[PDB]
């Protein structure tokens, strides 16, 4: 219901609805793991060797681990093999002798493959007595008066993605590429950027897996990477180089307003830290990628066909939101998978 001759002060940085959403997604995400199987008994001493490959003496990245495992009955046991990534095994101290990385702190529930990870749009209908306003000014900075508001009973489609370096499938701005901040001359606050034109990314995993069921316990099944038929090929992502150069040209054109028209804007890779804040994290068909993005963020900008490849690394266990004793084991998925996404903005 579009209002008229009305001015309401908006401030996204001191908003409370984003904090309620960050609480609700965590609580609901924990509520979608309790019926699934806890993977306590698999935390056991592994005997691992290299995967069958023409090993070159410069990469691991796959491990062929044999171990004892209980059966349907409690008495018997079975020798069984699986394929784990190198970021999930740690050499505890012939063939070597490993263990899983989560075994030092906490056993972790695996995700039931009936539960999909993909986002569905989440609307926010206001309750009785309250109301939700909406800015509509196309040049809305982020803080201050929006002179064209509109009340609404329930919000638009918000699809919840999880991504770190550059956010995906995010409602894009209309007139031009926009930047947003709280105090631009402050360093601790991030500088959000929302695009006009969605630059496209294609990501894949070429390894043709084979999902294999192992019965840990009666009524509990464990899903292990059984075999790699086809060929061992590293996961990657592709963006168009021309559109990415054009899109960085747009954001450099926008950033020169806040900093002076004669400055040298250059982009660097991440400074360091843990894994999933330097690399680009997302999910793709239910399996979590981590993609190095130094190939996009190196340039310089003075006052006046192909496609960029960038490598990707995969973890099977994940610890998102960094709790004390909760990780999860994302089970491997059958066959080669790929997913296509528009890039809405970057941080």
């Amino acid at each position, epitope marked *: 219901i579009h209002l008229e001759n009305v001015t309401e002060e908006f401030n996204m940085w001191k908003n409370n609805m984003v904090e309620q959403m960050h609480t609700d997604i965590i609580s609901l995400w924990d509520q979608s793991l309790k019926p699934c199987v806890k993977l306590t008994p698999l935390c056991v001493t592994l005997q691992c060797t290299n995967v*069958t*490959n*023409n*090993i070159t003496d410069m990469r691991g990245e796959l491990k062929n681990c044999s171990f004892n495992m209980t059966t349907e009955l409690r008495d018997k046991k079975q020798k069984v093999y699986s394929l784990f990534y190198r970021l999930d095994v740690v050499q505890i101290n012939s063939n070597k002798e490993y263990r899983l990385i989560n075994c030092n702190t906490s056993a972790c529930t695996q995700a039931c493959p009936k539960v999909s990870f993909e986002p569905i749009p989440i609307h926010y209908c206001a309750p009785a007595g309250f109301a939700i306003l909406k800015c509509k000014d196309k040049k809305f900075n982020g803080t201050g008066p929006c002179p064209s508001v509109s009340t609404v009973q329930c919000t638009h489609g918000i699809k919840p993605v999880v991504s770190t370096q550059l956010l995906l499938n995010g409602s894009l701005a209309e007139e031009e590429v926009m930047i947003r901040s709280e105090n631009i001359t402050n360093n601790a606050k991030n500088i959000l950027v929302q695009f006009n034109t969605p630059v496209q990314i294609n990501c894949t995993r070429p390894n043709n897996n084979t999902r294999k069921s192992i019965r840990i316990g009666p009524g509990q099944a464990f899903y292990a990477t059984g075999d790699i*038929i*086809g*060929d061992i*090929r*590293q996961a990657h992502c592709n963006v168009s180089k021309a559109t990415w150069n054009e899109t960085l040209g747009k954001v450099v054109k926008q950033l020169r307003k806040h900093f002076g028209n004669n400055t040298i804007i250059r982009f660097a890779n991440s400074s360091g830290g843990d894994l999933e804040v330097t690399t680009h994290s997302f999910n793709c068909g239910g399996e979590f990628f981590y993609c190095n993005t130094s190939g996009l963020f190196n340039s310089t900008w003075i006052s006046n066909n192909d496609s960029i*490849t960038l490598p990707c690394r995969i973890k099977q266990i994940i610890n998102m939101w960094q709790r004390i004793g909760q990780c999860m084991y994302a089970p491997p998925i059958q066959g080669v998978i790929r997913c296509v996404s528009n890039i809405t903005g970057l941080i």
Partner: antibody, heavy 132, light 108 residues
Framework: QVHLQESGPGLVKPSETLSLTCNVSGTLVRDNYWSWIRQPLGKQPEWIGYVHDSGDTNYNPSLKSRVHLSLDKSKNLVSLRLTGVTAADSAIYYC??????????????????????????WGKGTSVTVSS | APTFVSVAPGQTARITCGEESLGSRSVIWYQQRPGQAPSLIIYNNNDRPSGIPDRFSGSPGSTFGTTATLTITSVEAGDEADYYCHIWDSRRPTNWVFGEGTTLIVLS
């Protein structure tokens, strides 16, 4: 059109060194890439090693210990030097050029290719039988 | 150990050689006349050089879990010799020794 031929002793005692030759016809030695092939009777052949120009040379992992090779740069031949002949060396020896190709199967910048060699022509072969 | 395949002169003869495929392969086929050096016939998985006719066929090297096969159509007397396979597997390491040579013989 090429014509290549080796010349060795052909009558070798156990625990003895060994040498061979490679004459040229049609094409000299600095242009192409060279290899060595041996074959015991009633057996599949065995590919000893290959030499490039500018010193790129690789051998068997089994025969890594003892064999050594070189070219004859000014005289336009290829040499050979083997150490410690035993009863497992009686085989007709060959000489061959080789052509190499790439068989790319994936992303090229991630080093997902591999060279593969194939012997386009062949020598005529000399029997080098170990003689106790 | 050299297996024998026998077919009428004019029919097709198939030759299997080597370990079952794991990665992408690059097979090379030879031809050994008795008392001579070999002679190459197929240099890629299916490509053949000049002077060797197109009645030969190789198995394509983009199939996983099969065996490298050489297919001969319209056999003759001059094609009655030994064959050899040499697989370059993109997964298994370098083959420094050829496959087992199946001796090809024609009846009558």
């Amino acid at each position: 059109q090429v014509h290549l031929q080796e010349s060795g002793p052909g009558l070798v005692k156990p625990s003895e060194t060994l040498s061979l030759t490679c004459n040229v016809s049609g094409t000299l030695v600095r242009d192409n890439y060279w290899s060595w092939i041996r074959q015991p009777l009633g057996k599949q052949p065995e590919w000893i090693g290959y030499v490039h120009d500018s010193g790129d040379t690789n051998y068997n992992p089994s025969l890594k210990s003892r064999v050594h090779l070189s070219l004859d740069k000014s005289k336009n031949l290829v040499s050979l030097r083997l150490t410690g002949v035993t009863a497992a060396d009686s085989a007709i020896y060959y000489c061959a050029t080789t052509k190499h190709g790439r068989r790319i199967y994936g992303v090229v910048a991630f080093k997902e290719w591999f060279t593969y060699f194939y012997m386009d022509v062949w020598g005529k072969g000399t029997s080098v039988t170990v003689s106790s | 150990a050299p297996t024998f395949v026998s077919v009428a002169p004019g029919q097709t003869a198939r030759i299997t050689c080597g370990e079952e495929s794991l990665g992408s392969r690059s097979v090379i086929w030879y031809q050994q006349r008795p008392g001579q050096a070999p002679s190459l016939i197929i240099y890629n998985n299916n490509d053949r050089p000049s002077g060797i006719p197109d009645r030969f066929s190789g198995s394509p090297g983009s199939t996983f879990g099969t065996t490298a096969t050489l297919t001969i159509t319209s056999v003759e007397a001059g094609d009655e010799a030994d064959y050899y396979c040499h697989i370059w597997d993109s997964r298994r390491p370098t083959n420094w020794v050829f496959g087992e040579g199946t001796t090809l013989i024609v009846l009558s």
